[PDB]
Amino acid sequence: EVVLHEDKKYYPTAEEVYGPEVETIVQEEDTQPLTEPII
Amino acid sequence: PFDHCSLSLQPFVYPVCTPDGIVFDLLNIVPWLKKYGTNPSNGEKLDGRSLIKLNFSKNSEGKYHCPVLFTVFTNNTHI
Amino acid sequence: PSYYLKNTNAETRETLQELYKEFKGDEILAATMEKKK
Amino acid sequence: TMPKPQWHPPWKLYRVISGHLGWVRCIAVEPGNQWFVTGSADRTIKIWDLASGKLKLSLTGHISTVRGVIVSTRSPYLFSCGEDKQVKCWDLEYNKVIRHYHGHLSAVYGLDLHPTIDVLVTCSRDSTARIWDVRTKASVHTLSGHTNAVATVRCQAAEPQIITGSHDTTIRLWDLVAGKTRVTLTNHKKSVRAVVLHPRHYTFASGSPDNIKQWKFPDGSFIQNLSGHNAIINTLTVNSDGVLVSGADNGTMHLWDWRTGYNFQRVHAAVQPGSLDSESGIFACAFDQSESRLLTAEADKTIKVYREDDTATEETHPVS
Amino acid sequence: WDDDVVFKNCAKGVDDQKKDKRFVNDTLRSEFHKKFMEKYIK
Amino acid sequence: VTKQRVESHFDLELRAAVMHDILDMMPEGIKQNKARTILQHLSEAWRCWKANIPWKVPGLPTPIENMILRYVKAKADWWTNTAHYNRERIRRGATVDKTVCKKNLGRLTRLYLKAEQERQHNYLKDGPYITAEEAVAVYTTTVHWLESRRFSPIPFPPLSYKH
Amino acid sequence: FKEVGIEFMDLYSHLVPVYDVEPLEKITDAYLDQYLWYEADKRRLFPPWIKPADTEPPPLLVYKWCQGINNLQDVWETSEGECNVMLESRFEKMYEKIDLTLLNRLLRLIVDHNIADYMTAKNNVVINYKDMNHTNSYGIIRGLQFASFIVQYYGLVMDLLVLGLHR
Amino acid sequence: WEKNQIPNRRFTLWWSPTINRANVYVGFQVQLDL
Amino acid sequence: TAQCFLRVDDESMQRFHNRVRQILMASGSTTFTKIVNKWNTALIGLMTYFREAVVNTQELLDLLVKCENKIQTRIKIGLNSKMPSRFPPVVFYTPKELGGLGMLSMGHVL
Amino acid sequence: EVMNADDPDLQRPDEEAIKEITEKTRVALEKSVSQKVAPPSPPAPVMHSPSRKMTVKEQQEWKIPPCISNWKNAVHINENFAKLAEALYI
Amino acid sequence: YLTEHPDPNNENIVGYNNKKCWPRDARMRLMKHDVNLGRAVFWDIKNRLPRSVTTV
Amino acid sequence: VWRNTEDEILKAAVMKYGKNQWSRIASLLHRKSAKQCKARWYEWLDPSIKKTEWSREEEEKLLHLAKLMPTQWRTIAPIIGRTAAQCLEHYEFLLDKAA
């Protein structure tokens, strides 16, 4: 087995729906602070 | 420190070190290695046998001092 | 089954034996839980 | 009825980004193929490394949707524009707004920086467009006349310098300096949202629900009616080798060759995990600078990245 | 001691549950929302 | 645009975007598809999303329904994210207001009650999570304790009761 | 029974629910709750360590706890390598996870079956808020006049789970 | 002490001669002409 | 044999501060008497419960003075709108038998 | 024609012309901006397509049911419940 | 506990939380015997409560 | 309790006003409250309340459930499509004819 309510996933996964090769990314935050120049 | 454990992380009683040098006690890492085939120093698998006995000198006060050099060991000196 | 379950006592052990002896599938909830293609 | 159409190898999806919390309305590429800018309805503006596909930065400018952005190739400037009635400019060494060109009356819809005269040209749902001095916050012309929201603009050095297509289903070509209407085309039936200018053929195409149409400069000579991708079209992007891309509203992306107008691929993309299919959609496209890879910002918070297909031959993929 | 307790270790194979590394494009079920609700309702 | 007119504004922009998009693509109802009525149905779909009631009006041309779902999903997600943000302001103390306090309370409860309705129905569909072994262990162990405490079970309260 | 109405009260830092029961059922629950506590006390159900107790206000509790720690045996000695550990936590969701039927059996162990079925059934109602509804069939409704007795009970149960009957 | 309508006008009155000491506040001498 | 050091805890100082913020926000229509009542009451709800950890907590004391002085400013902008200088304090700290507001003060000390 | 008739007929006139015109427009733009700083046109013929009228099929296929509003006026049971209750009775 | 969750790189220092109101010498000090005891005890406690009924 | 006159006024008021403004409705009849109107409508009046006798299969389901989920009638009654009142009294009746 049984799945507690916080442990259940109703939505098929990204690797499930896209395939083997698709290099999927997730990004919550940045690699920089606001000061450091990109230019 | 000089005499502080890796697994229990306090005063180690018997020196029995993995061949690399980051040392511990056999009587300490015994249950960890027996119940998990690897150790805390490295995630990779371990054989218990190669952990070899070592004995550190007792000096005038009882301090761990170099057998040949007699110099006193502290938290910093090279081992 | 009785993994996760250190120290089975006598009457729990008994109740569990008797349940796994006696229970087979029900119908009302099996129906409760066809689409013309 | 045509010479046998050339053979362009197909395109395959390879890398998918999911970082936004709203629709991804617009996307642009940096001059040197190192990073691309995204502006969303989440109100963020997010800069991403083009290689590692990693979010290099995010910046919280606007108040509502960012409807369009553009990066300067003559400066480290980045100009944003959104349905907050406002247009902003960012310095990208200190990552900050540096001037804001007030003036429109409603949602900006799109804009472009003129390649040589340092002005902006922005189109707005307020039935106009404007020409902005870069630095001094000066608007020299309210290019006016479209009977409704000027759904887009593109600007170029040669005459005419400004093409704007609208929901009036018309297209209008303007003289920049007198800021006056020169020419109109009115072939279309349903509103026209996407206009694109060829790099080396002095021509340009416009898309609408009916189908694409093609025109020859500077006059507006109709050329060659392109049909097949019958869905609300949102961005057209054209490549070096004459590959032309129509991103539709409902996810269905269609490819053709610019010369013959030969629709040679339909890609029909798959949505993220949690997004219902009805939320599928394409909202903008852009080839990289080196034109090897292709970015598409979709209507389900994702950025899909397609690559030229290497295993393609004339027999793997014939032309018909 | 310990001779009488009822549940031996239940956290044997719970290897961190990488839903917190999934990304779900669906507001009312994203992990951000779940945790924010967990924080702000009692 | 200023925090007062943010809501009214964004609403205007949304309704008009809907008008442009579909009621220039979907027609062939060419005269006027009773757009005004399709927008009434927009509003009603929203209302029902806010009240957690499955809105399912059957006779709708599926592409029109596709549009409406795209747009309500947009708007509701905006709603949520602005709720997250205002509540973070109010917890950070940043500012005061007599509206953006009551408004956010309302929004935040509605989000909660939606989560709950979900979690109950999930429990029913996924069966008691406390399997049977755990149930029997707990039960029996309680009984052991009570009996070992000679605890006289309380009896239903007699009518002519002293107290 | 009828249906209860919910609404949140706001402390700016975390909302907290606040229910509303019908008046008749209010009165009945109030009585039942005084009764249950009066007996349960008289018969010494709740052992001592279940401690929002009647005899001491919380600060006196703190003092009691300190000096309790103090009067242990050799507590401050660290010579031979002893270590003391004080740990403190929450149960992180007890209300929302009380399971109705099993709670019904655990009450049948304590009161007679008529009282028991009253309590369990009352915890199963329709929760209103201006337009939304549902039937609260998993958790427990903290807002009914005898939620306190049920919570302290379920506590004692999980206490026995943590300690183990011996200790 | 007491062992539409207005706010605490009574409190304003009763503590008047201290809340109008012109030393405190500072500014005009706008006396009521009547 | 040992010494216990008390000190009010964060969560609790925080909920104090929120109670005061709640006073300010919600009461714009109420009279000064009602404001000062809600203040008095929050205060003794803090002191007469904590009672020793308080004096031992500098940071709390800062909070107390800040908040007090803040509600005195709220009644002051109650009269006029022009902020006035000085302002004799008696009219706050005077018992309500003499027609003051009788606000209980915890701040004047260093 | 619909083909590749004349590629240079299409090819863009010379960069040199763009530079001269760019400077011309730049100065003209300076003149207008500096000066300001110190019944529309006839309807062009609708070069349009004809409509293909609305059949009955799509004439109803874009019929929209009216607004019948629930507001506007102006279950499945898992079977393990069985296991649980049976076990507890035992 | 260390058998059950071997931490190889000694991250048990960062995950820990100690009080940040007090001075330095009044808070909890990070000696590895201590921190490991800290987590080992709590983990033993949590292991007695079925996840499905409650938790810590 | 309810009298047929109040009952009819309820029918008409609901079918006119929609299920959502019970304040206006209860304002209509005297000695009737909005909460009561809502309750009565969903309990008895609304047409979806199926008013017949219990099939053998319906009683099988009822009995089986009330054995499965003790005393939770507002949980059961949707599963067999009657009100809590119907399920409750009718289970009482089966229990009494049995004993």
Side-chain angles (χ1 to χ4, degrees), chain G residues 124-140:
Chain G
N124 178 328
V125 289
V126 158
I127 278 193
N128 175 342
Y129 176 98
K130 320 190 199 122
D131 9 340
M132 353 208 154
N133 279 222
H134 56 321
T135 59
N136 176 94
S137 101
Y138 188 20
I140 172 209

mmCIF file with all atom_site columns, all heavy atoms in Angstrom, chain G residues 124-140:
data_model
loop_
_atom_site.group_PDB
_atom_site.id
_atom_site.type_symbol
_atom_site.label_atom_id
_atom_site.label_alt_id
_atom_site.label_comp_id
_atom_site.label_asym_id
_atom_site.label_entity_id
_atom_site.label_seq_id
_atom_site.pdbx_PDB_ins_code
_atom_site.Cartn_x
_atom_site.Cartn_y
_atom_site.Cartn_z
_atom_site.occupancy
_atom_site.B_iso_or_equiv
_atom_site.pdbx_formal_charge
_atom_site.auth_seq_id
_atom_site.auth_comp_id
_atom_site.auth_asym_id
_atom_site.auth_atom_id
_atom_site.pdbx_PDB_model_num
ATOM 1   N N   . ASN G 1 124 ? -17.553 11.760 12.061 1.00 0.00 ? 124 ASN G N   1
ATOM 2   C CA  . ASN G 1 124 ? -17.735 11.471 10.646 1.00 0.00 ? 124 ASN G CA  1
ATOM 3   C C   . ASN G 1 124 ? -18.864 12.347 10.133 1.00 0.00 ? 124 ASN G C   1
ATOM 4   O O   . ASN G 1 124 ? -20.019 11.934 10.129 1.00 0.00 ? 124 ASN G O   1
ATOM 5   C CB  . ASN G 1 124 ? -18.045 9.999  10.467 1.00 0.00 ? 124 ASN G CB  1
ATOM 6   C CG  . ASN G 1 124 ? -18.295 9.628  9.074  1.00 0.00 ? 124 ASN G CG  1
ATOM 7   O OD1 . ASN G 1 124 ? -18.807 10.396 8.299  1.00 0.00 ? 124 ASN G OD1 1
ATOM 8   N ND2 . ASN G 1 124 ? -17.965 8.408  8.738  1.00 0.00 ? 124 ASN G ND2 1
ATOM 9   N N   . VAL G 1 125 ? -18.531 13.538 9.671  1.00 0.00 ? 125 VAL G N   1
ATOM 10  C CA  . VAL G 1 125 ? -19.550 14.502 9.316  1.00 0.00 ? 125 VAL G CA  1
ATOM 11  C C   . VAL G 1 125 ? -19.184 15.193 8.031  1.00 0.00 ? 125 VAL G C   1
ATOM 12  O O   . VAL G 1 125 ? -18.153 14.908 7.429  1.00 0.00 ? 125 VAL G O   1
ATOM 13  C CB  . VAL G 1 125 ? -19.721 15.540 10.410 1.00 0.00 ? 125 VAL G CB  1
ATOM 14  C CG1 . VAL G 1 125 ? -20.361 14.926 11.568 1.00 0.00 ? 125 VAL G CG1 1
ATOM 15  C CG2 . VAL G 1 125 ? -18.394 16.036 10.783 1.00 0.00 ? 125 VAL G CG2 1
ATOM 16  N N   . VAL G 1 126 ? -20.028 16.114 7.621  1.00 0.00 ? 126 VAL G N   1
ATOM 17  C CA  . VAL G 1 126 ? -19.911 16.819 6.366  1.00 0.00 ? 126 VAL G CA  1
ATOM 18  C C   . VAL G 1 126 ? -19.367 18.192 6.678  1.00 0.00 ? 126 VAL G C   1
ATOM 19  O O   . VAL G 1 126 ? -19.935 18.900 7.504  1.00 0.00 ? 126 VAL G O   1
ATOM 20  C CB  . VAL G 1 126 ? -21.280 16.918 5.694  1.00 0.00 ? 126 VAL G CB  1
ATOM 21  C CG1 . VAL G 1 126 ? -21.315 18.028 4.736  1.00 0.00 ? 126 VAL G CG1 1
ATOM 22  C CG2 . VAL G 1 126 ? -21.604 15.646 5.032  1.00 0.00 ? 126 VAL G CG2 1
ATOM 23  N N   . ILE G 1 127 ? -18.271 18.579 6.055  1.00 0.00 ? 127 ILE G N   1
ATOM 24  C CA  . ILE G 1 127 ? -17.582 19.798 6.437  1.00 0.00 ? 127 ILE G CA  1
ATOM 25  C C   . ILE G 1 127 ? -17.856 20.879 5.417  1.00 0.00 ? 127 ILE G C   1
ATOM 26  O O   . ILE G 1 127 ? -17.523 20.739 4.243  1.00 0.00 ? 127 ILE G O   1
ATOM 27  C CB  . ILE G 1 127 ? -16.086 19.557 6.584  1.00 0.00 ? 127 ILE G CB  1
ATOM 28  C CG1 . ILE G 1 127 ? -15.826 18.971 7.944  1.00 0.00 ? 127 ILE G CG1 1
ATOM 29  C CG2 . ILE G 1 127 ? -15.399 20.826 6.508  1.00 0.00 ? 127 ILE G CG2 1
ATOM 30  C CD1 . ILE G 1 127 ? -14.418 18.976 8.291  1.00 0.00 ? 127 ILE G CD1 1
ATOM 31  N N   . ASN G 1 128 ? -18.446 21.961 5.865  1.00 0.00 ? 128 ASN G N   1
ATOM 32  C CA  . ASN G 1 128 ? -18.978 22.972 4.986  1.00 0.00 ? 128 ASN G CA  1
ATOM 33  C C   . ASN G 1 128 ? -18.029 24.140 4.987  1.00 0.00 ? 128 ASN G C   1
ATOM 34  O O   . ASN G 1 128 ? -17.329 24.368 5.963  1.00 0.00 ? 128 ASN G O   1
ATOM 35  C CB  . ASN G 1 128 ? -20.345 23.398 5.470  1.00 0.00 ? 128 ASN G CB  1
ATOM 36  C CG  . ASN G 1 128 ? -20.928 24.520 4.680  1.00 0.00 ? 128 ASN G CG  1
ATOM 37  O OD1 . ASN G 1 128 ? -20.241 25.230 3.974  1.00 0.00 ? 128 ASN G OD1 1
ATOM 38  N ND2 . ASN G 1 128 ? -22.227 24.703 4.809  1.00 0.00 ? 128 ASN G ND2 1
ATOM 39  N N   . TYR G 1 129 ? -17.990 24.864 3.890  1.00 0.00 ? 129 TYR G N   1
ATOM 40  C CA  . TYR G 1 129 ? -17.340 26.162 3.800  1.00 0.00 ? 129 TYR G CA  1
ATOM 41  C C   . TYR G 1 129 ? -17.840 26.719 2.488  1.00 0.00 ? 129 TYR G C   1
ATOM 42  O O   . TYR G 1 129 ? -17.922 25.974 1.512  1.00 0.00 ? 129 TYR G O   1
ATOM 43  C CB  . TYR G 1 129 ? -15.833 26.065 3.820  1.00 0.00 ? 129 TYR G CB  1
ATOM 44  C CG  . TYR G 1 129 ? -15.185 27.385 3.635  1.00 0.00 ? 129 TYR G CG  1
ATOM 45  C CD1 . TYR G 1 129 ? -14.737 28.092 4.693  1.00 0.00 ? 129 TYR G CD1 1
ATOM 46  C CD2 . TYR G 1 129 ? -15.003 27.917 2.405  1.00 0.00 ? 129 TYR G CD2 1
ATOM 47  C CE1 . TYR G 1 129 ? -14.143 29.284 4.528  1.00 0.00 ? 129 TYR G CE1 1
ATOM 48  C CE2 . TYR G 1 129 ? -14.417 29.113 2.245  1.00 0.00 ? 129 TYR G CE2 1
ATOM 49  C CZ  . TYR G 1 129 ? -13.988 29.778 3.306  1.00 0.00 ? 129 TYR G CZ  1
ATOM 50  O OH  . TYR G 1 129 ? -13.407 30.982 3.151  1.00 0.00 ? 129 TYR G OH  1
ATOM 51  N N   . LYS G 1 130 ? -18.034 28.022 2.415  1.00 0.00 ? 130 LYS G N   1
ATOM 52  C CA  . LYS G 1 130 ? -19.196 28.582 1.750  1.00 0.00 ? 130 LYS G CA  1
ATOM 53  C C   . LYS G 1 130 ? -19.805 27.710 0.664  1.00 0.00 ? 130 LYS G C   1
ATOM 54  O O   . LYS G 1 130 ? -21.017 27.524 0.665  1.00 0.00 ? 130 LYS G O   1
ATOM 55  C CB  . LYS G 1 130 ? -18.835 29.938 1.176  1.00 0.00 ? 130 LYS G CB  1
ATOM 56  C CG  . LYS G 1 130 ? -17.951 30.717 2.106  1.00 0.00 ? 130 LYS G CG  1
ATOM 57  C CD  . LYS G 1 130 ? -17.788 32.119 1.662  1.00 0.00 ? 130 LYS G CD  1
ATOM 58  C CE  . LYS G 1 130 ? -16.587 32.717 2.302  1.00 0.00 ? 130 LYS G CE  1
ATOM 59  N NZ  . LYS G 1 130 ? -15.677 33.163 1.238  1.00 0.00 ? 130 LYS G NZ  1
ATOM 60  N N   . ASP G 1 131 ? -19.032 27.166 -0.274 1.00 0.00 ? 131 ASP G N   1
ATOM 61  C CA  . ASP G 1 131 ? -19.670 26.273 -1.232 1.00 0.00 ? 131 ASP G CA  1
ATOM 62  C C   . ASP G 1 131 ? -19.124 24.857 -1.163 1.00 0.00 ? 131 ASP G C   1
ATOM 63  O O   . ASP G 1 131 ? -19.737 23.940 -1.705 1.00 0.00 ? 131 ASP G O   1
ATOM 64  C CB  . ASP G 1 131 ? -19.549 26.800 -2.651 1.00 0.00 ? 131 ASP G CB  1
ATOM 65  C CG  . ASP G 1 131 ? -18.647 27.970 -2.752 1.00 0.00 ? 131 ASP G CG  1
ATOM 66  O OD1 . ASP G 1 131 ? -18.411 28.614 -1.723 1.00 0.00 ? 131 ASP G OD1 1
ATOM 67  O OD2 . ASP G 1 131 ? -18.150 28.244 -3.858 1.00 0.00 ? 131 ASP G OD2 1
ATOM 68  N N   . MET G 1 132 ? -17.979 24.643 -0.539 1.00 0.00 ? 132 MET G N   1
ATOM 69  C CA  . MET G 1 132 ? -17.403 23.311 -0.616 1.00 0.00 ? 132 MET G CA  1
ATOM 70  C C   . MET G 1 132 ? -17.941 22.393 0.458  1.00 0.00 ? 132 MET G C   1
ATOM 71  O O   . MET G 1 132 ? -18.408 22.837 1.500  1.00 0.00 ? 132 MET G O   1
ATOM 72  C CB  . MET G 1 132 ? -15.911 23.357 -0.494 1.00 0.00 ? 132 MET G CB  1
ATOM 73  C CG  . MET G 1 132 ? -15.367 24.687 -0.497 1.00 0.00 ? 132 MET G CG  1
ATOM 74  S SD  . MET G 1 132 ? -13.750 24.471 -1.159 1.00 0.00 ? 132 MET G SD  1
ATOM 75  C CE  . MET G 1 132 ? -13.594 26.082 -1.785 1.00 0.00 ? 132 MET G CE  1
ATOM 76  N N   . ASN G 1 133 ? -17.880 21.099 0.196  1.00 0.00 ? 133 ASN G N   1
ATOM 77  C CA  . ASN G 1 133 ? -18.344 20.088 1.124  1.00 0.00 ? 133 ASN G CA  1
ATOM 78  C C   . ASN G 1 133 ? -17.422 18.892 1.037  1.00 0.00 ? 133 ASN G C   1
ATOM 79  O O   . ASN G 1 133 ? -16.682 18.754 0.067  1.00 0.00 ? 133 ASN G O   1
ATOM 80  C CB  . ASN G 1 133 ? -19.753 19.635 0.798  1.00 0.00 ? 133 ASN G CB  1
ATOM 81  C CG  . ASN G 1 133 ? -20.800 20.564 1.316  1.00 0.00 ? 133 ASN G CG  1
ATOM 82  O OD1 . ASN G 1 133 ? -21.815 20.130 1.826  1.00 0.00 ? 133 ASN G OD1 1
ATOM 83  N ND2 . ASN G 1 133 ? -20.587 21.841 1.160  1.00 0.00 ? 133 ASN G ND2 1
ATOM 84  N N   . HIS G 1 134 ? -17.444 18.053 2.065  1.00 0.00 ? 134 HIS G N   1
ATOM 85  C CA  . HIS G 1 134 ? -17.013 16.670 1.967  1.00 0.00 ? 134 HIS G CA  1
ATOM 86  C C   . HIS G 1 134 ? -17.340 16.009 3.285  1.00 0.00 ? 134 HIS G C   1
ATOM 87  O O   . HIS G 1 134 ? -17.799 16.660 4.215  1.00 0.00 ? 134 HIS G O   1
ATOM 88  C CB  . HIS G 1 134 ? -15.542 16.517 1.663  1.00 0.00 ? 134 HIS G CB  1
ATOM 89  C CG  . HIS G 1 134 ? -14.646 17.196 2.635  1.00 0.00 ? 134 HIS G CG  1
ATOM 90  N ND1 . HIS G 1 134 ? -14.928 18.418 3.188  1.00 0.00 ? 134 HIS G ND1 1
ATOM 91  C CD2 . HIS G 1 134 ? -13.454 16.822 3.143  1.00 0.00 ? 134 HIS G CD2 1
ATOM 92  C CE1 . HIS G 1 134 ? -13.949 18.769 4.000  1.00 0.00 ? 134 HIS G CE1 1
ATOM 93  N NE2 . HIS G 1 134 ? -13.040 17.817 3.987  1.00 0.00 ? 134 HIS G NE2 1
ATOM 94  N N   . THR G 1 135 ? -17.099 14.712 3.372  1.00 0.00 ? 135 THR G N   1
ATOM 95  C CA  . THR G 1 135 ? -17.396 13.967 4.582  1.00 0.00 ? 135 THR G CA  1
ATOM 96  C C   . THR G 1 135 ? -16.114 13.522 5.240  1.00 0.00 ? 135 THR G C   1
ATOM 97  O O   . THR G 1 135 ? -15.386 12.704 4.692  1.00 0.00 ? 135 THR G O   1
ATOM 98  C CB  . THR G 1 135 ? -18.215 12.742 4.268  1.00 0.00 ? 135 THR G CB  1
ATOM 99  O OG1 . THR G 1 135 ? -17.466 11.952 3.353  1.00 0.00 ? 135 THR G OG1 1
ATOM 100 C CG2 . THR G 1 135 ? -19.474 13.144 3.610  1.00 0.00 ? 135 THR G CG2 1
ATOM 101 N N   . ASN G 1 136 ? -15.891 13.974 6.445  1.00 0.00 ? 136 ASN G N   1
ATOM 102 C CA  . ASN G 1 136 ? -14.589 13.859 7.069  1.00 0.00 ? 136 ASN G CA  1
ATOM 103 C C   . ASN G 1 136 ? -14.398 12.456 7.594  1.00 0.00 ? 136 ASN G C   1
ATOM 104 O O   . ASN G 1 136 ? -14.557 12.217 8.786  1.00 0.00 ? 136 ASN G O   1
ATOM 105 C CB  . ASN G 1 136 ? -14.451 14.852 8.197  1.00 0.00 ? 136 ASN G CB  1
ATOM 106 C CG  . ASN G 1 136 ? -13.181 14.689 8.903  1.00 0.00 ? 136 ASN G CG  1
ATOM 107 O OD1 . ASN G 1 136 ? -12.202 15.350 8.598  1.00 0.00 ? 136 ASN G OD1 1
ATOM 108 N ND2 . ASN G 1 136 ? -13.160 13.787 9.847  1.00 0.00 ? 136 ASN G ND2 1
ATOM 109 N N   . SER G 1 137 ? -13.996 11.542 6.729  1.00 0.00 ? 137 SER G N   1
ATOM 110 C CA  . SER G 1 137 ? -14.002 10.138 7.078  1.00 0.00 ? 137 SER G CA  1
ATOM 111 C C   . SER G 1 137 ? -12.635 9.558  7.349  1.00 0.00 ? 137 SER G C   1
ATOM 112 O O   . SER G 1 137 ? -12.521 8.347  7.483  1.00 0.00 ? 137 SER G O   1
ATOM 113 C CB  . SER G 1 137 ? -14.649 9.344  5.976  1.00 0.00 ? 137 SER G CB  1
ATOM 114 O OG  . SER G 1 137 ? -13.654 8.740  5.205  1.00 0.00 ? 137 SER G OG  1
ATOM 115 N N   . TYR G 1 138 ? -11.595 10.367 7.408  1.00 0.00 ? 138 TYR G N   1
ATOM 116 C CA  . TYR G 1 138 ? -10.306 9.814  7.771  1.00 0.00 ? 138 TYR G CA  1
ATOM 117 C C   . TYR G 1 138 ? -9.806  10.374 9.076  1.00 0.00 ? 138 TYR G C   1
ATOM 118 O O   . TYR G 1 138 ? -9.523  9.627  9.998  1.00 0.00 ? 138 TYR G O   1
ATOM 119 C CB  . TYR G 1 138 ? -9.274  10.106 6.716  1.00 0.00 ? 138 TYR G CB  1
ATOM 120 C CG  . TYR G 1 138 ? -8.005  9.394  6.982  1.00 0.00 ? 138 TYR G CG  1
ATOM 121 C CD1 . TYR G 1 138 ? -7.973  8.318  7.800  1.00 0.00 ? 138 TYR G CD1 1
ATOM 122 C CD2 . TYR G 1 138 ? -6.836  9.809  6.430  1.00 0.00 ? 138 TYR G CD2 1
ATOM 123 C CE1 . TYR G 1 138 ? -6.834  7.673  8.045  1.00 0.00 ? 138 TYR G CE1 1
ATOM 124 C CE2 . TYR G 1 138 ? -5.681  9.174  6.687  1.00 0.00 ? 138 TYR G CE2 1
ATOM 125 C CZ  . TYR G 1 138 ? -5.689  8.098  7.499  1.00 0.00 ? 138 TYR G CZ  1
ATOM 126 O OH  . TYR G 1 138 ? -4.534  7.418  7.786  1.00 0.00 ? 138 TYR G OH  1
ATOM 127 N N   . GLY G 1 139 ? -9.687  11.679 9.169  1.00 0.00 ? 139 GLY G N   1
ATOM 128 C CA  . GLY G 1 139 ? -9.050  12.263 10.318 1.00 0.00 ? 139 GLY G CA  1
ATOM 129 C C   . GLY G 1 139 ? -9.960  12.269 11.519 1.00 0.00 ? 139 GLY G C   1
ATOM 130 O O   . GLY G 1 139 ? -10.829 11.432 11.675 1.00 0.00 ? 139 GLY G O   1
ATOM 131 N N   . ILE G 1 140 ? -9.708  13.195 12.383 1.00 0.00 ? 140 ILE G N   1
ATOM 132 C CA  . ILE G 1 140 ? -10.565 13.462 13.518 1.00 0.00 ? 140 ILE G CA  1
ATOM 133 C C   . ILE G 1 140 ? -10.823 14.956 13.565 1.00 0.00 ? 140 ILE G C   1
ATOM 134 O O   . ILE G 1 140 ? -10.014 15.761 13.115 1.00 0.00 ? 140 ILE G O   1
ATOM 135 C CB  . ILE G 1 140 ? -9.884  12.946 14.783 1.00 0.00 ? 140 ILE G CB  1
ATOM 136 C CG1 . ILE G 1 140 ? -10.618 13.366 16.015 1.00 0.00 ? 140 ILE G CG1 1
ATOM 137 C CG2 . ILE G 1 140 ? -8.566  13.548 14.873 1.00 0.00 ? 140 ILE G CG2 1
ATOM 138 C CD1 . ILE G 1 140 ? -9.710  13.491 17.166 1.00 0.00 ? 140 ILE G CD1 1
#
